[PDB]
Design an enzyme around this catalytic site. Structure first.
Site, PDB file in Angstrom:
ATOM      1  N   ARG B  60       0.827  -1.201   0.000  1.00 24.59           N
ATOM      2  CA  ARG B  60       0.000   0.000   0.000  1.00 24.59           C
ATOM      3  C   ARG B  60       0.865   1.257   0.000  1.00 24.59           C
ATOM      4  O   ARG B  60       1.709   1.441   0.887  1.00 24.59           O
ATOM      5  CB  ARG B  60      -0.930   0.016   1.220  1.00 24.59           C
ATOM      6  CG  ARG B  60      -1.644   1.349   1.456  1.00 24.59           C
ATOM      7  CD  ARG B  60      -2.543   1.281   2.715  1.00 24.59           C
ATOM      8  NE  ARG B  60      -3.231   2.537   2.999  1.00 24.59           N
ATOM      9  CZ  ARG B  60      -2.878   3.403   3.950  1.00 24.59           C
ATOM     10  NH1 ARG B  60      -1.840   3.154   4.751  1.00 24.59           N
ATOM     11  NH2 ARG B  60      -3.570   4.524   4.116  1.00 24.59           N
ATOM     12  N   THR B 315      -6.293  -0.534  10.128  1.00 28.23           N
ATOM     13  CA  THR B 315      -5.822   0.588  10.947  1.00 28.23           C
ATOM     14  C   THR B 315      -5.757   0.274  12.436  1.00 28.23           C
ATOM     15  O   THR B 315      -6.771  -0.015  13.088  1.00 28.23           O
ATOM     16  CB  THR B 315      -6.653   1.849  10.705  1.00 28.23           C
ATOM     17  OG1 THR B 315      -6.659   2.117   9.294  1.00 28.23           O
ATOM     18  CG2 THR B 315      -6.031   3.035  11.425  1.00 28.23           C
TER      19      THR B 315
HETATM   20  O1  LIG Z   1      -6.721   3.963   6.397  1.00 33.77           O
HETATM   21  C1  LIG Z   1      -7.321   5.015   6.720  1.00 33.77           C
HETATM   22  O2  LIG Z   1      -7.397   6.018   5.976  1.00 33.77           O
HETATM   23  C2  LIG Z   1      -7.987   5.150   8.073  1.00 33.77           C
HETATM   24  O3  LIG Z   1      -8.089   4.148   8.817  1.00 33.77           O
HETATM   25  O4  LIG Z   1      -8.433   6.270   8.394  1.00 33.77           O
HETATM   26  K   LIG Z   2      -4.425   8.331   2.355  1.00 34.00           K
END
Ligand SMILES: O=C([O-])C(=O)[O-]
Ligand SMILES: [K+]
Ligand SMILES: O=C([O-])C(=O)[O-]
Ligand SMILES: [K+]
Ligand SMILES: [Mg+2]
Ligand SMILES: [Mg+2]
Lengths: 522, 518
Positions: B60, B315
């Site tokens: 990513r 996250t």
């Molecule tokens: O990955 C993201 O943008 C988040 O969790 O806010």
């Molecule tokens: K971003």
């Protein structure tokens, strides 16, 4: 004056789904929960939380049980904490309608392994570097002279139980050492995972057969002190087998026979021998701190769900513990993993959830209590009661005990009419425990005159104990009416229900027993 | 037993839980895709090689930061590391590249560089918020610049403003032409370029900014496999992203990140337009109460499972491993429960982009996911997926469900499927077999994109097409058989399910063979 879509509270749309998958699909962040919060909250009391004024706010924020961690602190320190807990608790006693009982729990040191003091003042730290050599010594000359070259610890038989190649973990399993060479009273190790090492840190020897007693002579001195201090429950560290539970229970003597014994499962043998430990115990703590060092971190969730499941099956309390909101020691809101962990412990079936450093030592103890309260209440609404209640019944034996039939009938009735509460009149707690094991959605208001019953009731999901202070009425029916009216006033004052709502009332022991009535709130 | 098979045979979910056994070891195969954010900790070719070995399936790239030159070099390093393994086509792992857009982000400016690099915001103090770019690089405890130029129109007196993962909070006290006067509610240390949330406001930033257009076009030019589109609020936002990707980018997968209240409310129309979903819990847990995020997560995972579209849990899953070599107990639990919920993929952000233990974090997601995959109650999940699936007489769908049931009946070592564009493998994955799905393709993009689906283990066949259709099918099946044997998924005496096409010129994948291994 509607408009389009009125959102059912309490995840009631998800509650009606015919599959678990569709249950999940219907979970709705815009469906607010009820006022009642059923999961007990256990808070470790320490320097951040032991003042009377902070304890008052902890109680207001939702603390049900004060945990005293006897791994730290001397007896006068714990005596003063207990005194402060009781001062704060009884500051609310003038209004029995609103008074919340608060339990006191003694958590044993048990067979811990601890390091010594870093050389100097003991408050410094040394940086252990990966690949460096570190000598572990039992020579007491170094017990206050630990540094990056020599590390003293207090387990005198350690050299017997470890071998070359074994791993040794220090400080929440964050520092790891590999044993390269053995000696008489020393080990030569290589630092695998390095880090900053402070004084008196916990040591774990996964896969080693540690032969320290579950209850040492010093632990007995702590347990006797706990009886003197009238604690409500013992959280017994590192329970490995049924006989360890008996060592805790029997030494409390006749005077301590009513103290609840909660076995902490935090090593591999406790998991393997879980069924015999559960049978001997009053309840269980999933003590995930040590557990996740003693066994691989990736297996802890299996052990947690296994134990919560088996405790739910047995109708015995189970506590989920340790690092649930860990980042809140330093930050005012939790990580997303921590929010998820608390919710999933409740969905798993935990009777109670727990805070350790978050309330004992952290910068945001009140916020941590408040966050466990908020998450628990949201998660309780999301439980798929349609499946849970069906399975608890099916996995519960048909017995001739009339009181068990009353309890399952009451919970069945509570689901049928979406009752605002199950009110239970109880002396020992037993009748309320029997209802809680079927996990009603509705709160259980347990009216008792027994203060210890009121405090110990917090071990069970959904039991909201209220302590009746009125004298016993000579006419039994008048005394029942008094206690039921007390519960009605509690529920109205706390927002559990309103006049005209339907509730279930179990009127307890009669000089048949525990008659059930389904009534509108007067 | 192994693989939690004793728990798998329980007649109730409660008994299923009671039977989970820490001494029951899982299979070798790990089905949940692992997405890793690349940054300074993980950008070198040497580290990326170890990330791939450790289990990374998708790299990513976070376009909230960095230049196109920087990201082009990251992508170059990812491909260098990935292709360093191509000399062994049986063991080579495809690695996908994902572009995560900046989107309608709000951020503060740079802290004035002549003092402490962080400033202390203290409870009760005043703090002025300015839009005057003179202060864009002079932020301090008196004046804080942020980049949302229209913020004064969407807030009023009393509005709350959150800064830096919602840890700092401000309350608006007065307004102005291009400024706000606030009081610090929750104080803390403030660094540079931190994210800002306005949970009570209708933020009117474009779904796809001019910068996002540049980044998306760069992603097309760089041949990325998928886009993670930030702050998707509605179907028309997805349409905008897809328009930018256009014809050249038409095969790039669009994963809509759900991270605000509106995205949750409009989830169904977003899911319909999207290829998949990310539960973007960082922003989501600031935009809505933290205690409600698990509801949104389980809702989205459930509905994505119901639709057969990939869903990523993202996250702070292992957040403490930014600084420590082992996760907290809540973090181990969170990863396990995301898999039990039904997440196709799990993700790492700071743990791999910036932290001190990127490889340990990847390895821990691999270990936990594999344990959790064995603990899934497939008996109930498969019954419910079947009951809720749309009604169809499609031969391919019927063959896929038949294959998954067969795989359970014989505890098969794998389901082998041949696919050009991915769909035939996706159709099997949506019924969530326990057995790994070895998807043989000659399409390198399909091989990379397949990582978005639970249990699809892509293998990129590099052999020439054979003259005979039946011989070419056999070659690709035999390739999967040797990959599975080499990776320890199965051995002689095991049984594997093999799904192949009907006949030359047909698009039906309607042929199922149950094959002793060998
Ligand atoms: O990955 C993201 O943008 C988040 O969790 O806010
Ligand atoms: K971003
Ligand atoms: O003792 C405890 O509470 C633990 O280790 O989690
Ligand atoms: K202890
Ligand atoms: Mg412990
Ligand atoms: Mg975000």
């Amino acid at each position: 004056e509607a408009g389009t879509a009125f959102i059912q509270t309490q995840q009631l749309h998800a509650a009606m789904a015919d599959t678990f998958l569709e249950h999940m699909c219907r979970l709705d962040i815009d469906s607010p929960p009820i006022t009642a919060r059923n999961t007990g909250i256990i808070c470790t009391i320490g320097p951040a939380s032991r003042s009377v004024e902070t304890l008052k706010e902890m109680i207001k924020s939702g603390m049900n049980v004060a945990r005293l961690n006897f791994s730290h602190g001397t007896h006068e320190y714990h005596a003063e904490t207990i005194k402060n807990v009781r001062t704060a608790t009884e500051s609310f006693a003038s209004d029995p309608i609103l008074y919340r009982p608060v339990a006191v729990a003694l958590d044993t040191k048990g067979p811990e392994i601890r390091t010594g003091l870093i050389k100097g003042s003991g408050t410094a730290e040394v940086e252990l570097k990966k690949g460096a050599t570190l000598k572990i010594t039992l020579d007491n000359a170094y017990m206050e002279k630990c540094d990056e070259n020599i590390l003293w610890l207090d387990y005198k038989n350690i050299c017997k139980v470890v071998e070359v190649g074994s791993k040794i973990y220090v400080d929440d399993g964050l520092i790891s050492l590999q044993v390269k060479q053995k000696g008489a009273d020393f080990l030569v190790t290589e630092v695998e995972n390095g880090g900053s090492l402070g004084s008196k840190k916990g040591v774990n020897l996964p896969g080693a057969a540690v032969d320290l007693p579950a209850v040492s002579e010093k632990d007995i001195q702590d347990l006797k002190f706990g009886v003197e201090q009238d604690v409500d429950m013992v959280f017994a560290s590192f329970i490995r087998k049924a006989s360890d539970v008996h060592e805790v229970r029997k030494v409390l003597g006749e005077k301590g026979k009513n103290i609840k014994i909660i076995s902490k499962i935090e090593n591999h043998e406790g998991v393997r021998r879980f069924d015999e430990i559960l049978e001997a115990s009053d309840g269980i703590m999933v003590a995930r701190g040590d557990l996740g060092i003693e066994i691989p971190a990736e297996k802890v969730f299996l052990a947690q769900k296994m134990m919560i499941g088996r405790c739910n099956r047995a109708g015995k309390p189970v506590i989920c513990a340790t690092q649930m909101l860990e980042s809140m020691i330093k930050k005012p809101r939790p990580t997303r993993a921590e929010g998820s962990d608390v919710a999933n412990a409740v969905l798993d079936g935990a009777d109670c959830i727990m805070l350790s450093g978050e309330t004992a030592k952290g910068d945001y103890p009140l916020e941590a209590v408040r966050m466990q309260h908020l998450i628990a209440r949201e998660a309780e609404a999301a439980i798929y009661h349609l499946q849970l209640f069906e399975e608890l019944r099916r996995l519960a034996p048909i017995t001739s005990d009339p009181t068990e039939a009353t309890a399952v009938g009451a919970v069945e009735a509570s689901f049928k009419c979406c009752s605002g509460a199950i009110i239970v009149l109880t002396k020992s707690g037993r009748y309320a425990h029997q209802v809680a094991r079927y996990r009603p959605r509705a709160p259980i208001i347990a009216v008792t005159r027994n203060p210890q019953t009121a405090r110990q009731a917090h071990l069970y999901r959904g039991i909201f104990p209220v302590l009746c202070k009125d004298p016993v009425q000579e006419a039994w029916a008048e005394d029942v009416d008094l206690r039921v009216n007390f519960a009605m006033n509690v529920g109205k004052a706390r927002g559990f229900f309103k006049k005209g709502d339907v509730v279930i009332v179990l009127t307890g022991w009669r000089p048949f027993t525990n008659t059930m009535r389904v009534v509108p709130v007067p």
